[model samples]
Target: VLDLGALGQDFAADPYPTYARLRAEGPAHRVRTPEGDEVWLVVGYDRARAVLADPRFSKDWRNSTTPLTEAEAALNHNMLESDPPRHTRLRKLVAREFTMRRVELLRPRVQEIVDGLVDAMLAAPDGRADLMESLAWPLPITVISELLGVPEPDRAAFRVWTDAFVFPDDPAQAQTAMAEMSGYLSRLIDSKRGQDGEDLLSALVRTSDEDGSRLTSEELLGMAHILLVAGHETTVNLIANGMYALLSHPDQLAALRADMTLLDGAVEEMLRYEGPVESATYRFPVEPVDLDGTVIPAGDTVLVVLADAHRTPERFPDPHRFDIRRDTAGHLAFGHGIHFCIGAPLARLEARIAVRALLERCPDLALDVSPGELVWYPNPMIRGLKALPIRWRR
Candidate 1:
């Protein structure tokens, strides 16, 4: 198997070049992940999109040989990691509550949050701040927390636990993180069980307890865990990654500033250019899958690299060039088919408001450090910056 480390230390930072080379070679390759696990890494837009929706490649960990800690396995009941009819049942229940109307209702509140954040950011005496900490991180965390009824005092711990759960610095700590998060959510869900509140979590608890289509105790815990972890984390990177792309590409940035109508297209382009999710969550083939001529044996781990899919020249000409005006159709930034992100509308609203407001408020906004100095998270599933430093006029 090809060692990912052989690509160079910069693989995590700028993986496109390596992915591009791989795509040119073939649609799939047997490679050793940075963490040393063997996976069939699928590249190219067609194959990536296909693999994302292919039933042969299952999301159920129980069907795979890949190992997970007991704590990790316990939390795997969420829709993202489950197969139908379980996935179908879980998604339908969650979707009943997390609807478009709920997300639209959040627009004004989202704007209020963004305006508040921008006010605080511009108030910075140094006329500078790390945007990731100040705006990117806080906006989504606050929004998701408020949506889920996470008490104000508990929000900080929520962010800490989710961060550790997704991007743990230590494997041992990851297991502990999962257990701690599950314990916290278990208690929170229990408390919500007694309430008649309006937050998403409360709604979910009611659905599980009161609805005819009942969610088991584990399903409830899994639902809460997935919403909390997936809700804020992905949006944080969306804001950060989009801003970085705009700032680094002056021409595109100027075009966006010149015409605010480009905002929607800009967000899509940002998703395509440098999406928050580098790859879909792990999929294990329950049946031998064939892509082009490559045959992936059953039970082998596979990762559909969304990073490479968006950059494939066949689907998007001059894909590496960040043009905000590009037609970003068919981009798998958010995985396609039944597993498409349920929180997508909320993420988009948050990003649109966050990006536009930041640009308008900080007319002179620019990166605080050279591009090379920015460090990206090592987690393969989520692609995001460690910090995004910026300076703007006060």
Candidate 2:
């Protein structure tokens, strides 16, 4: 097994070089994660995509040799950690309420939210604020919360809980947040039952399948947890990281500003250059899985390093260059196959809207600190900033 620590302590800050080395060394490496857990890191675009789509690798936590705590397991009932029929069923329930048409309909509301936040941000007396705090972090949070019918007053607590839940450094802390959020969701689901509401959560509470079955009490809690955490967390990073990529590349930012039509391409490029997710979530083979002569035994954790895969030179020539016009069609910023993020459409919309609004309102937006000062979250699962401070003049 290769010790990733040999790559140096700053590996997390700039993992691409190490990834390139590993990819050249043969695309798969047994390594240790930041949490000291052992796993196989699959590099390169093709191989990563393969691992993700391989049916041999199952997501069922039950396949895991390590038992999960009750609270942790409670959050696992959603489609992400389950196999088909269950995966298909859970996805159908969410797809019914989370349609692309529904997301597109939200465009106007999303614009309104972005504009209001821009107004508030431009009003900053210091003319400097963390964009993550003022807008990027809150915009999607508000949109998702409002979509799920969360009371506006309760939204702040959701942030605290979600932060702990998604990027928790402490296992105990993560489980605690999970348990608390699950409890709150149970109450909310109970209250929404039989109510005539248009929100997604309420719809889920009342939705039924052909046989007149619906999400059970535990299923409801699990779905709510997944929505609250996965729903907006990625967009938070997309906005911040997307903007960072643009502003850091002056030519690219100028191109975007010159032609708003480039917004779609720009968003796609952002997903390629610095995707919100560092790696696809865990997957494990149900039996020995061979990869180009490497034998990965059953139950060994495998992580598709999307962060590395997306930037591979073979697939994305001149991989490190930040070009808004690049054809980013096949980027795996969103995973492939059954577990592909259902939230992609919404995240893309939020990013496009947020970036457009930020550029339009702040003609002189720039990073508030030197690049070296920006602290990225150390968690391997999430690729995001601790905060994205910016100085802008409206």
Candidate 3:
């Protein structure tokens, strides 16, 4: 049984080869994850899309076979873990406020933040700096933390909490983190009024539609937790992984520099090539069904490896080649179906400003250390480097 524990160490550093090896077994692979739990991992572009939209496989955690307490589950009651009517209602409530227009309005502000971070990098005592820590890590944390009225969250603490909260290495530890984090968010939720202090969380707490719809107390905590954790972690990867892709591939970087108009394309390529959210959160089946000739037991945990889906040769010719000009039309980077990322617009906007600014500002940007020296996180939920050392000048 190719259980998860045995696939530690090198697996974290590089997951492509191991995933490619698993491709031979077909769409659904019977395997254990590194967290020492068994689940059905869905790969391939075709099947992954199918499984993603399949209502047979559910997102509500209450359906899963786990030891998490009701309180543990309530701590994460955002739209990502609900069924249609409930999911629709929850998402609608949020969509009323978190619109693309709202995100677009942040473009200038995002650019300002990105500019300051790059300025800091240039002023470092040593010319070389870890791009992940200096730029990628702080930008999103600052934006989302401030938006949600979360005051100067400890980036390190958020990383640890979000990682364990999403993909638990230990259930007990996940529980403990949830117990502590949830209380803090609960307090923040209680303190809000009519956009009283200039923050989204406060706005959400205050505003509701003409129908008198509003987020309940539990939903408020859930929304705050998901927005803070999910928004922070995923954007961190988009910038970090996207830049890592460009810097590592000098030819592509030069190509991007030559034509600034390809900024959108460059961002798309980054998502397809090295997207941060490696897989969709777990979706378990409500009934037994055959998947790629293998029957998944009912209520089995199914993980759609979004990272591997774009690499499917049949779906994307010359899939592994990172070509910014390639037609990346149907890639599942932001995912598909109703569960598609609500923050897609925001994430794309942030990555666009950050990457474009970085390349234009630091014309000679290059990695400070060889690729082998960098460390990739082993967490299944996050596919990003622990640190990305780079330099723009000698």
Candidate 4:
């Protein structure tokens, strides 16, 4: 039996090989973390899908006998932490502001943002740039900032806060960062409630149903935090990872560039081929569940290995090969079932524009840093390079 904790090291670097071993070993098995946390890591495509769709697997952390520790709990008290009617209600309230119509209307604006970022990146000295800082980070940040009414000057500082909160290497620093972010949002929400503004934050502050249904101040802050973090973080990886995949696969990149219409399908393939988020938001089983004869008992924390599922041959033929033309509509990169990402349309639009723009502007773009030198976050939940350096002639 492979020590599951050692799997973290492999998972952080490249998860596929370890995932394959796990799948071959059994559909479900206990893997003890270095920290001594014995959790169930579900491998295999069908089992992963079932785990995500099963209602017996609760999303609410509060219900768990072993809830997230204080530091981790505060960092993620958003809708992703709730279950059932509460989750449904919270989702509905936020869904009102993220309608498909609104996302569709933003497509032109998304393209404009992409164009501007590309221009700035190209103008940089030496024809080299950190795509994460130049294009990937700012594009979604700008969109979400505009949508949420964050002051233009505050965006940069907010980025720091978000980074500190989500990816802080030290647990103490991460806790402090979460507290700071919560404090900032609390103040911002209070300020917006008293003013008239035409942003999502203001809209959320003023929203109330005929039956007097409305988000409380706490819920409002939580939802705003979710929108801001999730809105930018996942898309950041999509843009970065998509570019990485394309650059590595010149043939596929050339194919995408030759036919711009393939942008949509290409984006879907990118998500399936090398998705942004590595795992589904954490979920725990409420009752015993059987998967291919392997039984997972109630109360065990479960992580649905999305990267594993995406690359499973059972789900997609030639899964190891990167193909822009593949039918990848059902990829769990955006997740599956009710927990499906609410920001799917916006994410898709941003990725399409971002990838298309990069290919068009820097047709010869190539990685400056070797894959071995690329730094990945240690967290298992989010899979992306810390920095993606690339160069192209002006």
Best by lDDT: 1
Per-residue accuracy of model 4 over 9-86 as CA lDDT, tens digit each: 556668778778888878777766434456777877787888788898887876566766554555454677777788
TM-score of 3: 0.93
Taken over the whole model, the C-alpha lDDT of each candidate is 0.86, 0.83, 0.81, 0.79
What are the TM-scores, per candidate, against the unseen true structure? 0.96, 0.95, 0.93, 0.92
The window of 10 residues in a row where model 4 has the poorest summed lDDT is 208-217
Q: lDDT tens string, model 2, 1-394? A: 7665454436656777877888887877898766566888888899999889998988987777757788887778888888888899888887855667877999999999999998998898989989889998889999999988888887888778867866576878878987888778878877887778888888777763212356765677778878877888888988998888888888898888899899999999999999988888888899898888788888888889999988888889899998899988889998999888898889988898999898887889987877788777655567888788889864
Distance from true location, Cα of 247 in model 2, Å:
1.0
lDDT per residue for candidate 1 within 212-305, as digits (tens), equals 3678777888988888889888899999999999999999999999999999999999999999999898899988877888898988888899
**TM-score rank order:** 1, 2, 3, 4
Clashing residue pairs in candidate 3 are: none
Q: Give the per-residue lDDT digits (tens) of candidate 3, residues 195-266.
A: 367788877676532123566766777788888887878888889888988888878899999999998998
Better by TM-score, candidate 4 or 1 = 1
Better of 1 and 3 by TM-score: 1
Candidate rank order under lDDT: 1, 2, 3, 4
